[PDB]
Structure 1
Amino acid sequence: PTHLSVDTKFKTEGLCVDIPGIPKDMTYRRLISMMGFKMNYQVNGYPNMFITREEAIRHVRAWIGFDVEGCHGTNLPLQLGFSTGVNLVAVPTPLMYKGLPWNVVRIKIVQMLSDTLKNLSDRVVFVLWAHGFELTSMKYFVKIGPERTCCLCDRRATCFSTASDTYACWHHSIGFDYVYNPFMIDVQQWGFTGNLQSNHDLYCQVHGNAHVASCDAIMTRCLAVHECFVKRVDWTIEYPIIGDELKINAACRKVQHMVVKAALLADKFPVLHDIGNPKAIKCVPQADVEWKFYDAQPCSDKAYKIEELFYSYHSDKFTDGVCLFWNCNVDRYPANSIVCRFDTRVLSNLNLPGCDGGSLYVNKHAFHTPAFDKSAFVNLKQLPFFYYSDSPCESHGIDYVPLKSATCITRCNLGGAVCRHHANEYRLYLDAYNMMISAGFSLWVYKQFDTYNLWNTFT
């Protein structure tokens, strides 16, 4: 059992207002046929247009909410809405486009999906709250058949062109008119009571209902993300490398070691309370400090309340020394903290839109993160960039321009002239730092933190 059997039953109650008389007894095999598609007993990689919840979770980067609302059915214009915010009007003859025939609408759909998905996934998964019109509109822009490869590269084909009779992936589909072998899932099959809005609004207040198809498309995908990444969590699912994952993760480790080491050297805290990932390792193994760990898994719904993490009777005295919250999202950090907090508003191919202001950050594993909130940092200040090193000044073993910087905290810079080794290491660190910030991470520190206290750690 890897794919969804076409012989699986499909509940049709949600479809009977657009499709009156629809049989209660229905399989995906009969539904696909009713949608105007012929599967021809083909064992060529595409067993079903519909996929399981587990297959959908593995392809969350491909998710595109899709809704169709009757503007006035083959006789009336249809409003096609996508979770990208696009509304297209198709005539049978928050962006809102005027009514156009299907032969031009389908070209826009291919362009939109290709621009949205080329850097995210090798496919598309239409996320539906199926009522009928969305399923019966698919024949006007979708073509199915055996799994194919792109005409210009090795990637799987996602588009088809009637002008050239060729197939393309999302990167090579300019001018293509059909979506080829898309996938889809109907959220209504998961067992819900009530309409889309009532279920969506239970968990999210950030997506309103402006009564347009793209609003329903957005709410549908948001509800699906809530069910699959908020109420249910699975950190055993791996996701392919699509960007700077490895550089970002390595940069995160370098910056954490740098910041914690310098905070310990500058303020000499006798104890450090490391709150977060139960599999955390000491980021500064040589530090003298008493290192105490507290287990908290990544919160995917609401940020942890500091009163629940710290209180109910451990060192007990979290007020002693410093608290390290490295990606441990809390409502309000104590004043004696070192914090790394992911900013959910960041635009990147790793960061997908999420539920109730939160975002779905996908880097090796999927992590739904509660909405970024500036008020969590009221007791702290932004951590300024700096590079600190106590290593000997020695080159060992890429051409040079001498480094001049007030933030290169080294013996050579104290002495008046940055050495080649510390200049190379400073530039590498600055690159790793900028990589982590641009990925969406934000750094915060206790107000007394001052890099001026680091200069006397070389004597």
Structure 2
Amino acid sequence: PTHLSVDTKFKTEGLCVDIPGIPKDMTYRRLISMMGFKMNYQVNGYPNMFITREEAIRHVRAWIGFDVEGCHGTNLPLQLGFSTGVNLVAVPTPLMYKGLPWNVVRIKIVQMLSDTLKNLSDRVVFVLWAHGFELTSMKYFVKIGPERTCCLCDRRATCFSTASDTYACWHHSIGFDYVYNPFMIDVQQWGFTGNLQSNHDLYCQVHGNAHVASCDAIMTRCLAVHECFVKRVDWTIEYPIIGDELKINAACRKVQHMVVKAALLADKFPVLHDIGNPKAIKCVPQADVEWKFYDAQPCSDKAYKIEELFYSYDKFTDGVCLFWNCNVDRYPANSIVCRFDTRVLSNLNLPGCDGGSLYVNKHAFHTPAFDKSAFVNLKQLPFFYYSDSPCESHGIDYVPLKSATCITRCNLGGAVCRHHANEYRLYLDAYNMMISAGFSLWVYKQFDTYNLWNTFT
């Protein structure tokens, strides 16, 4: 039950305006044949061009919305739209390109997909709101066959070249002209009422409709992300490592310990309200503070309202509140906050629904749109490094460190020791790693690193 059987029925009602007379009774087997492809009763890793919802969710990094609009059916030009914002016009002789024959259009498609996907996934999943022209145009830039490996590496093959008769992955596809063994899924098979725009606009106000193919491609993928990662959530699905996931996650634990420990030392809060992930552990386990946990799963739709989190019947105004990746609409003044900036560009952060983003780091977290007004009661947390550890070098070469933000006994004494200089530069790299990944740090306005110097006396 892991792959989509080709004998599964395909609802054709959405196709009958582009393809009048299409049979109501239709399987994927007959649909693929109708699209001009032949599968040959082949057991070589490619059982179906179309995939299940579950397989699509596991390969969300490969999702490319795809739409085709009749520009004027073999006799008229076609506008090819992709969720990358690209519009290509193919002739049978926000970006918008003029009409060109299929033999040059397919070269642009391979280049576009390869640059988009090489650092994201081992494949492409075309996300469709299928009405006909997009399915019948695939024969002009798609080749299928047995699963293969790249001619220059061990990755699976995603492209084919008619010039050299060879195969390549996204990384080595320069000059290739055909997409090889792509995957696809028709969102309209999921049981919607009404057209694409009416269903998309139920949940998203960020993507308009300029009535060009790329806008439909964007809305289609956006609707799919909402259905699979907003209204539905599955945190059991694991995703492969494609970047600095481990360093980013390790940096997050180190910065969280550093910031909370220093806030407790500087202001001596009697109680800390740890609001968020119900799997949370004390990040400063040796602190004397009264540590109270409050369970809140990561919100995937709208940011939590602070009124429903705190109230409905309790003294969150006592001490300090810790919101580590707990997105609320407005943080109280006595808060320590880590909030993911959905606007960040990285291979881990995919475009999301209604201004949000889909952050995929081991697991997929759809995150509500970043909002600067949520931090009005707070200020940005400045960088600093604090350590009460002994100045002792145990066991890399050294240039003396000078920094006003190395809060250690040795710097209080006027000369940073080598150990705390090593730890400072290691923490600075971790801090910059986490900030670059899109995380932002905010703190109550009274926070002052000057209060940490007298923790050495």
Q: TM-score, normalised by structure 2?
A: 1.00
Give, in whole Å, the separation in 2 of the partners of 1:61 and 1:104: 27
Report the Cα offset of residue 15 of structure 1.
0.1
Q: How far did residue 23 of structure 1 move?
A: 0.1
**C-alpha distance in 2, partners of 1:38/1:309?**
56
Structure 2 counterparts to residues 310-349 of structure 1, below 5 A: 310-313=310-313, 316-349=314-347
Could you say what secondary structure the match of 2:298 adopts? coil
- The separation in 2 between residues aligned to 1:107 and 1:71, in whole angstroms, is 20
For 1:360 and 1:220, the matched residues in 2 are separated by 15
Distance 1:43 1:200 in 2: 37
Q: 2 CA distance for matches of 1:440 and 1:405?
A: 25
Cα distance in 2 for partners of 1:413, 1:268 equals 23
What stretches of structure 1 of length at least 5 have no aligned partner?
Answer: none
Distance 1:312 1:162 in 2: 66
Deviation at 1:137, TM superposition (A): 0.1
CA displacement at 1:125 relative to structure 2: 0.1
Shift of 1:218: 0.1
Q: For 1:235 and 1:396, locate their aligned partners in 2 and report how far apart those are by CA, in whole Å.
A: 41
Q: Deviations over 1:200-252 (max 9, x none)?
A: 00000000001100000000000000000000000000000000000000000
Q: Which digits, 9 at most, give the CA deviation of each residue in 1:375-424, with x for residues without a partner?
A: 00000000000000000000001111000000000000000000000000
Q: Who is 1:374 aligned against?
A: 372
- The CA RMSD measured in Å over matched residues stands at 0.2
The C-alpha deviation readout for 1:238-295, integer Å capped at 9, x for no partner, is 0000000000000000000000000000000000000000000000000000000000
TM superposition shift of 1:456: 0.2
For residues 396 and 215 of structure 2, the distance between their equivalents in structure 1, rounded to whole angstroms, comes to 52
Q: Write the distance in 2 (CA, Å) between the matches of 1:358 and 1:368.
A: 7
Q: How much has 1:162 moved relative to structure 2? A: 0.1
Aligned-residue offset at 1:158: 0.1
Distance in 2, Cα, partners of 1:259 & 1:220: 41
- State the match for 1:95 in structure 2: 95
Distance 1:312 1:51 in 2: 45
Q: Tell me how far 1:372 sits from its aligned partner.
A: 0.1
| Structure-2 separation of matches of 1:165 and 1:450 | 65
Q: Give, in angstroms, the shift of residue 141 of structure 1.
A: 0.0
Following the alignment from structure 2 to structure 1, what is the Cα–Cα distance between the partners of residues 325 and 400?
A: 36
Describe the superposition over 1:143-199 as per-residue Cα deviations: whole angstroms up to 9, x where unpaired.
000000000000000000000000000000000000000000000000000000000
Q: What is the SS of the residue equivalent to 1:260?
A: helix
Residue equivalent to 2:282: 282
SS at match of 1:427: helix
Give 1:32-431 correspondences, 5 Å limit: 32-313=32-313, 316-431=314-429
Q: Report the 3-state secondary structure (helix = DSSP H, G, I; strand = E; otherwise coil) of the residue aligned with 2:240.
A: coil
Deviation at 1:358, TM superposition (A): 0.1
> Aligned equivalents of 2:84 and 2:170: distance in 1?
16
Aligned residue for 1:238, secondary structure, equals coil
Distance 2:77 2:299 in 1: 44
Deviations 1:352-382, CA, capped at 9 Å, x for gaps: 0000000000000000000000000000000
2:137 is paired with a residue whose SS is: helix
- Give 1:450's aligned residue: 448
Please state whether the residue corresponding to 1:44 is helix, strand or coil: coil
Deviation (angstroms), 1:301: 0.2
Cα shift readout 1:418-442 (whole Å, capped 9, x = no counterpart): 0000000000000000000000000
Cα-to-partner distance string for 1:296-353 (whole Å, 9 max, x where unaligned): 000000000000000011xx10000000000000000000000000000000000000
Q: Whole-Å Cα distance in 2 between the matches of residues 118 and 87 of structure 1?
A: 21
Structure 2 unmatched runs, 5+: none
Task: Please give the alpha-carbon distance, in whole angstroms, between the structure 1 residues aligned to 2:414 and 2:170.
Answer: 54
3-state SS of paired residue (1:272): strand
CA distance in 1, matches of 2:214, 2:399: 53
Q: Structure 2: how far apart are the matches of 1:413 and 1:338?
A: 26
How far apart are 1:13 and its partner, in Å?
Answer: 0.1
Matched residues in 2 for 1:97 and 1:418: separation? 59
Q: How many residues align?
A: 457
**Secondary structure, in 3 states, of the residue corresponding to 1:155?**
coil
Distance 1:223 1:299 in 2: 18
CA distance in 1, matches of 2:415, 2:289: 32
CA distance in 2, matches of 1:243, 1:83: 23
CA distance in 1, matches of 2:24, 2:400: 77
What's the secondary structure of 1:54's corresponding residue?
helix
Q: Deviations over 1:45-66 (max 9, x none)?
A: 0000000000000000000000
Q: How far does residue 139 in structure 1 lie from its aligned partner after superposition?
A: 0.1
CA distance in 2, matches of 1:312, 1:207: 35
Identity of aligned residues (%): 100
Cα distance in 2, alignment partners of residues 385 and 255 from structure 1: 10
**Helix, strand or coil for the counterpart of 2:292?**
strand
Q: Secondary structure at the match of 1:435?
A: helix
Q: Quote the Cα distance in structure 2 between the aligned partners of 1:399 and 1:269.
A: 40
**Which stretches of structure 1, 4 residues or longer, exceed 4 Å deviation after superposition?**
none
SS for the counterpart of 2:440 is strand
In 2, Cα distance between equivalents of 1:399 and 1:166? 49
Q: Deviations over 1:9-30 (max 9, x none)?
A: 0000000000000000000000
Q: Distance in 2 between matches of 1:398 and 1:83?
A: 47
Q: How far apart are the structure 2 equivalents of 1:402 and 1:17?
A: 73
- For residue 263 of structure 1, give the secondary structure of its aligned residue in structure 2: helix
Alpha-carbon distance in structure 1 between the residues aligned to 2:262 and 2:200: 45
TM-score (norm. length: structure 1)? 1.00
Rounded to whole Å, the distance in 1 between the matches of 2:273 and 2:407 is: 26
Separation in 2, partners of 1:312, 1:224: 34
